Amino acid sequence: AYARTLDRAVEYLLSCQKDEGYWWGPLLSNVTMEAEYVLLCHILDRVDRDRMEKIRRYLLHEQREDGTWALYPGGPPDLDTTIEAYVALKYIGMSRDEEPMQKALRFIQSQGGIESSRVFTRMWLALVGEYPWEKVPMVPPEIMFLGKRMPLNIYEFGSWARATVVALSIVMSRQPVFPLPERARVPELYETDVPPRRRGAKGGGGWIFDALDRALHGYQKLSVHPFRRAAEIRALDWLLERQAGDGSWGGIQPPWFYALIALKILDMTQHPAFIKGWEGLELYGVELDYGGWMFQASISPVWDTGLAVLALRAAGLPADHDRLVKAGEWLLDRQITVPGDWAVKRPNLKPGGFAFQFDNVYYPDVDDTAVVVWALNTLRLPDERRRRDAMTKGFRWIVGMQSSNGGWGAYDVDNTSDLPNHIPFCDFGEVTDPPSEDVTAHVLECFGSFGYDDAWKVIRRAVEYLKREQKPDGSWFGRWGVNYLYGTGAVVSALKAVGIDTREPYIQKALDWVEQHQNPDGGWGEDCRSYEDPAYAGKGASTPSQTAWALMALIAGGRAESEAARRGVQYLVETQRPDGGWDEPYYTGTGFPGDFYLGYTMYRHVFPTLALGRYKQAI
Amino acid sequence: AYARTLDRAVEYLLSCQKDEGYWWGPLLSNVTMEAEYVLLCHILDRVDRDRMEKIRRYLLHEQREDGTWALYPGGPPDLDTTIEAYVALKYIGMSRDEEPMQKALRFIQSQGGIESSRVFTRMWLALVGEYPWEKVPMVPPEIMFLGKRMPLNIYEFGSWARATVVALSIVMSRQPVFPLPERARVPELYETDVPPRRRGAKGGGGWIFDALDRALHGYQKLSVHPFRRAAEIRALDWLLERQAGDGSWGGIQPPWFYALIALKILDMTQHPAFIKGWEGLELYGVELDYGGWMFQASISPVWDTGLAVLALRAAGLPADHDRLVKAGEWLLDRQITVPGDWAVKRPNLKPGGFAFQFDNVYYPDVDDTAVVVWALNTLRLPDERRRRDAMTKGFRWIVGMQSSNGGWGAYDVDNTSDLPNHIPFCDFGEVTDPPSEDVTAHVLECFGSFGYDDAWKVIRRAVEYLKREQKPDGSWFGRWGVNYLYGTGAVVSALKAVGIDTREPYIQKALDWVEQHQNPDGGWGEDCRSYEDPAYAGKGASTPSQTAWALMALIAGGRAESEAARRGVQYLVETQRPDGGWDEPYYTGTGFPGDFYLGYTMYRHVFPTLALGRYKQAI
Numbered sequence A, B: 001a002y003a004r005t006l007d008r009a010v011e012y013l014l015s016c017q018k019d020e021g022y023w024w025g026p027l028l029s030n031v032t033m034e035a036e037y038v039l040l041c042h043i044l045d046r047v048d049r050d051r052m053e054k055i056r057r058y059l060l061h062e063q064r065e066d067g068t069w070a071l072y073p074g075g076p077p078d079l080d081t082t083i084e085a086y087v088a089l090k091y092i093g094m095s096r097d098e099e100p101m102q103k104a105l106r107f108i109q110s111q112g113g114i115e116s117s118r119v120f121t122r123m124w125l126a127l128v129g130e131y132p133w134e135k136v137p138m139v140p141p142e143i144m145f146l147g148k149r150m151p152l153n154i155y156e157f158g159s160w161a162r163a164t165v166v167a168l169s170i171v172m173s174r175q176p177v178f179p180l181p182e183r184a185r186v187p188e189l190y191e192t193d194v195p196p197r198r199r200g201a202k203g204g205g206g207w208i209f210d211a212l213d214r215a216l217h218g219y220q221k222l223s224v225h226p227f228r229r230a231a232e233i234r235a236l237d238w239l240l241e242r243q244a245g246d247g248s249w250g251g252i253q254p255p256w257f258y259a260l261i262a263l264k265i266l267d268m269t270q271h272p273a274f275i276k277g278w279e280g281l282e283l284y285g286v287e288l289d290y291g292g293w294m295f296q297a298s299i300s301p302v303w304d305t306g307l308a309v310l311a312l313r314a315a316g317l318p319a320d321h322d323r324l325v326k327a328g329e330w331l332l333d334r335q336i337t338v339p340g341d342w343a344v345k346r347p348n349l350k351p352g353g354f355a356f357q358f359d360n361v362y363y364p365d366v367d368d369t370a371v372v373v374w375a376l377n378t379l380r381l382p383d384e385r386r387r388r389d390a391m392t393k394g395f396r397w398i399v400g401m402q403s404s405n406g407g408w409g410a411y412d413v414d415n416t417s418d419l420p421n422h423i424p425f426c427d428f429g430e431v432t433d434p435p436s437e438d439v440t441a442h443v444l445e446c447f448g449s450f451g452y453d454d455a456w457k458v459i460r461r462a463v464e465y466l467k468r469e470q471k472p473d474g475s476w477f478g479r480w481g482v483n484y485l486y487g488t489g490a491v492v493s494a495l496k497a498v499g500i501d502t503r504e505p506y507i508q509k510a511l512d513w514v515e516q517h518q519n520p521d522g523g524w525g526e527d528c529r530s531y532e533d534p535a536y537a538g539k540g541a542s543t544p545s546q547t548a549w550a551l552m553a554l555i556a557g558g559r560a561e562s563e564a565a566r567r568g569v570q571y572l573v574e575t576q577r578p579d580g581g582w583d584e585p586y587y588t589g590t591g592f593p594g595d596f597y598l599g600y601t602m603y604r605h606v607f608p609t610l611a612l613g614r615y616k617q618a619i
């Protein structure tokens, strides 16, 4: 039955594999990457008329009928995203008259205007002179002086937040202004009567910070700020020490962009670091077939290659398949062997993790390290010395990274401080990196491959953590993937692998939940709204990936030979394309709950395969 | 008569001009650059059989009958240069047996062996494990803590010294060892009965540092060195901050190589600085036509382009010559507009100097700045705006560099501390950058063209400086060019340009000295020995450059219509090659009096033209 689905899915995946032997699907986010790029180019005085044209095509193409832009496809209009897209276009050429510019302008107005957008948006606008700097939460160079164990030192923030904060402290330190030509000034972003509805600090504002901010803004005004020259040079130095191999910082868009702005502020355009940073940008860009161009928020090669392998194996290919080997060898050269920023909490831990992207040695993550190691543990390579070797370093590093509660975070250990969540500046997404159910589940499944189990103290501490986190309805939240369908699938699949008894009550209470959310069309789906309003948990249009996820939670808990189970397999079988692929016009990836969503291009192909591979196993 | 000669020299130079519009002659030094590269490659584990071949044919081709290598051509065998070339070869393939390995080994031994070589040589050997680290002068990371105004802080050393010291402090901090395979171990460098005759610190040993070093080597042995981790990172960051545009450090070989070694030590072979630093190396290499390969100690494009222009103008071509304009435009894009290290003594000085090489913004020198500005002054470029403007910026940067005595140094102001000259480590060449007669003369000659006479207090302070420095026999020492013939030509040619009276006594006492040293063959020549033993001042085989120098001192002081004057012009007119060029198998350039000599390829072509250009003027 489904067997021709598996055969077609396989050959397809294999067609996607690059030569070097890895898979790499583009990462989808939202138009702010491109809009901010347009502005970075203006700031760095490096505008390419031809590029802008491809950009403008994309920006419009992405705009909706109502004239707004959202975070995920089919999502509510977003103010920040639309403001930034609006200014981006008006600068590229569009006149505030044109139908498209018209619609958006009226939406931005209906919302209270520029005064209702996040810090980043008002800050970007501050940079081109269309918004007062005095009204932007202040982050000072001096933060560089807080020691390792101090409230708010840069190591209390999550990896991604950290590097951005440092880059910005230099920029906010000088509060520079790169004027836009009159042609693109956007005063009209203020023309509204609607009351400005401002978003506050992610975790609630303490009148303390509010005051501290006001304090910092006045201080900024003095004629002399002692040791500030130093604070800066401490930041710049922190920056130059980490710049990734591809010229980026952390392999993510934000700190990368800010770090480049920062060197321009510091008159260092002709310094190796600035040059590598500038030209490394091109690797993240993507030429869209319909004429546009988009910039990736980050890149997922290692991650794609990792899942790719596991799916093709669970799906059937021999552990020594000449094509799967190209991948194994490739993954081995990827392992990171030097102290990262994680070393600050675990100095006697031996380097051995992996990154999400190509070259990013200072920021390996537990999620990637686990999937890559586990994946290797399923292949038979030529240099069995290295495979054995690599797997252990990664493994010992994963265990070394386990946080206090028994679960794993993404980049750091016990990055659970609650302090950063209240600063005025922090009003967008997560800012700390605490342990999550999904990353933890992926670790356990990994250990479980090697056979470790409920008997080992490390694994019990974890399962205790998962048991305590389980939601009332027996579902598990999905931190890096949308959402409860993602998390529950991950946990139940893991708990099954670490020997736990699939019959337990809390486990059953979970599968019931999964069978209970199947759409009429057989498959499962969960809309990104499930982070905002609970009435959406497990509800949403069916997707090949989210179906595949619910399928694993069932196949894992024994219910493989079920109705909902066989009904779901039908969905994947029916909806597959003639080439073996799958379509998925929705986002199933999560950047930050409620604020940033991602589209993982390979999920639609890999997971359906991995689920079908495991179904063909239960038989 | 001479006109056909000049006419040909002019067209020859014009044929050497690269496309972009600049001239660039290879810089010749000695085989240590290549021998050290071979070792750098071993250390960094990046050996290319094919290069080692070219490097071997080259080292061999440079060895002499007696089986030794010298600093300059026709110079006395050099122990350091030979030891290093010996080890280089033995590593590439040569067996201690073969004729070359034999003759050199004998020389080496007859000198006391490895124990008689400079610090660098014993240090390089220490790095591959053929010499104890404990016996090498120690320079610690901690030197990084001495403040701006403290005995021995890194800013008391000259630009070139400084960067090397920083790079090394990190290396000496770890005292790493990269073992050579048994095949190349060189124990035989110790097998000698001759008493090891060690060279001491440049200015002299103080029993203090002699103690303090033992001090350090002792502290080096402890189990704990507080704040050293941070002393190191200071040196690391210091380096990351100043890395040149081409990935080098200071555009010179020493700090560049040591900085790379230092990064490797710190597992930073995955970092942007090191990558760019490593691939930058190819630009300095040179493919030799006989199948050899040599690495330049530094590169002189700006410098060549500068004189090139001045010679072609003094010779005749229109100040608006479409060919010189390509050069003018090029030189304008070269001007450095950011605070260098010189800013540490002159914070309110506006950047406007130029560098010796292509991209080296942190280290512009007065010599280049002066020649480039002046040469531009003799042109008419299509952008009288930028031309007028740069000259002014550079002018001021020159003016603001004028040291305490009125005379300029190369890279820094009053870099006259006498302290560094006594450290055990400093036993090779200069280590500070005090003002010299030649740089000062080139500055004066620059102002001169604008129209600035002896009225201006600026000028006078300088001329006072020169007058006081003049040697007993009316000659002027040559710091960056060999030697008294160089200096004296520079001075007298300058004093003439700043309005001074060519008839004065001290001036005449100079020209007489010129006339008095003319070699019978009509020209002038000065051997590099004139730095070691006074007998050679103004003595040595006649060269096209040195002749042209003595010719300017004469044309300047009125004696253009003289015997020695027309006799010298005869020499150039004749010795000139059929293509228009000139040959010059000797070095006329000075790296460090007595220790490091350079061969400026373009000197043989540019100066004879410039001297003939000025003779065709006095008529």
Ligand SMILES: C=CCN(C)CCCCCCOc1ccc(C(=O)c2ccc(Br)cc2)c(F)c1
Pocket: A160, A161, A162, A164, A252, A253, A254, A255, A297, A298, A303, A356, A365, A367, A368, A410, A428, A429, A430, A431, A480, A591, A596
């Ligand atoms: C799925 C499994 C693999 N997993 C371990 C890696 C995937 C997560 C990393 C990719 C996301 O990268 C980011 C991250 C953030 C941002 C911010 O906007 C941000 C927001 C706030 C701040 Br403060 C700074 C930047 C961004 F733009 C991109």
Ligand SMILES: C=CCN(C)CCCCCCOc1ccc(C(=O)c2ccc(Br)cc2)c(F)c1
Pocket: B160, B161, B162, B164, B252, B253, B254, B255, B297, B298, B303, B356, B365, B367, B368, B410, B428, B429, B430, B431, B480, B591, B596
């Ligand atoms: C005439 C034109 C203008 N003039 C100012 C520029 C020409 C001089 C710069 C070119 C030479 O550069 C150097 C310099 C040094 C060294 C050292 O060996 C050295 C030895 C000891 C130490 Br401690 C450090 C480096 C070197 F190898 C090369």
Ligand SMILES: CCCCCCCCOCCOCCOCCOCCO
Pocket: A241, A242, A339, A340, A341, A342, A343, A344, A362, B229, B232, B233, B236, B266, B268
């Ligand atoms: C430079 C001192 C050598 C000691 C290195 C151990 C550093 C441990 O890492 C601490 C955490 O900071 C993250 C470092 O990654 C940055 C690279 O810095 C370069 C060499 O340390």
Ligand SMILES: CCCCCCCCOCCOCCOCCOCCO
Pocket: A229, A232, A233, A236, A266, A268, B241, B242, B339, B340, B341, B342, B343, B344, B362
């Ligand atoms: C990085 C803080 C910005 C203040 C720097 C201006 C300091 C003036 O220079 C002092 C002398 O140090 C030499 C600097 O050249 C090195 C580059 O460092 C990067 C930016 O200054």
